[PDB]
């Protein structure tokens, strides 16, 4: 499913660009923050990367709605395509999970 425990950020880009479409996304372990996770999302033919905060009390994207589990966070943003914006602003839609 959408969770890939064994890939890097670069590997995530290669997958999405070769096996995904615009709107495809996956979750993977974080390099900058070992033990954490990161969303890798494809849009406009390019791959973008969103940090997932795990406080031990909840999951979020260092802001926005808080979630008890990683899966529910992902579920929420798949169901609310307008909630994840950069400050540009531009929307980043989690549409299609790229399965493992």
């Amino acid at each position: 499913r959408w969770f890939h425990p064994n890939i890097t950020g670069v590997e995530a880009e290669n997958l999405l660009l070769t096996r995904g479409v615009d709107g495809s996304f996956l979750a993977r372990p974080s390099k900058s923050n070992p033990g954490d996770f990161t969303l890798s999302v494809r849009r406009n033919g390019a791959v973008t990367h969103i940090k997932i905060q795990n406080t031990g009390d909840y999951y979020d994207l260092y802001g926005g709605e808080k979630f008890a589990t990683l899966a529910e966070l992902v579920q929420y943003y798949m169901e609310h395509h307008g909630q994840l914006k950069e400050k540009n602003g531009d929307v980043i839609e989690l549409k299609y999970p790229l399965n493992c």
Binding site: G9, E13, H49, I50, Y62, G63, K85, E86
Partner: peptide, 11 residues
Amino acid sequence: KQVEYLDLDLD
């Protein structure tokens, strides 16, 4: 090698 991360506006 190290990849791009977005600045988000969420709150």
